[PDB]
Amino acid sequence: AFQKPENVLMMETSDSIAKFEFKPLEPGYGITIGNALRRILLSSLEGFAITAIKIEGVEHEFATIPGVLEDVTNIILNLKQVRFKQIVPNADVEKATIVISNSEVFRAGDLNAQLSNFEVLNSNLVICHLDKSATLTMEFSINKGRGYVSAEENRAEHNELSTIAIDSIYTPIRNVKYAVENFRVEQKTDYEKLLMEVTTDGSIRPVDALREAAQILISHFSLFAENKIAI
Amino acid sequence: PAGIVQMAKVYIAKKRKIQVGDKMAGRHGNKGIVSKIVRQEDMPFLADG
């Protein structure tokens, strides 16, 4: 005997926030399931970000550009925070060329996702405040990765006296939930509610990430249950 | 300076992060030093994630 559940329901208030519920369960078993999911989800997914920058007329991370209200440091620092998305698979790494040449306030979505391979989710972020007359040329590199990498490792890519490497936070997830509570019939017990929540950046719906986490976890237990090589 | 002809100079700057061994403090005497950089998962997390 094994009280197997079948109730897996999705409700999906938005493109990025979703709920899930798991019904009915044998006692003390859902905590295990959910905490395993929480760890793997929040640890080991895959994303994209920007790494390298080449500004015209600046040579190092402490310069200043005429007519631009921020340092180069703050340009890099806030460029760090811009979350992205694919539209096509197989997009490995990309280089971009922005030429802002008008009396503007330079914002995120103002980035023409001019490469067909890729796009920006968060468009309404303020990169910088130009004057009426500043002219700025920038060149981007966006690449895929996992977890977190600091700057100096990204010194690998050929500074060429101009390139500045930047930090890169790759994780595509922002918040995770699970909670459990009993449900019952009169005199007969052992009904369990698991209620779970996934909050992402919008680069991918909750279902794909949840599926991938479970695929990796089953891939781990598979070897560790069947194959039994001995000493 | 009278006896010398010239003096040259260079500036060197370093951008410095945190790592284990650095010192921290607060406004009430709590001197301390960083012991371990914990990954975000296993930090004790409240009922709202």
From Swiss-Prot, chain A:
Example of a GO MF term: DNA binding
GO CC annotations, alphabetized: cytoplasm; DNA-directed RNA polymerase complex
Residues spanning the signal sequence: none
Note on domains (UniProt): The N-terminal domain is essential for RNAP assembly and basal transcription, whereas the C-terminal domain is involved in interaction with transcriptional regulators and with upstream promoter elements.
Record-stated family: Belongs to the RNA polymerase alpha chain family.
Stated role: DNA-dependent RNA polymerase catalyzes the transcription of DNA into RNA using the four ribonucleoside triphosphates as substrates.
Protein name: DNA-directed RNA polymerase subunit alpha
Residues shown, of full length: 5 to 235 of 330
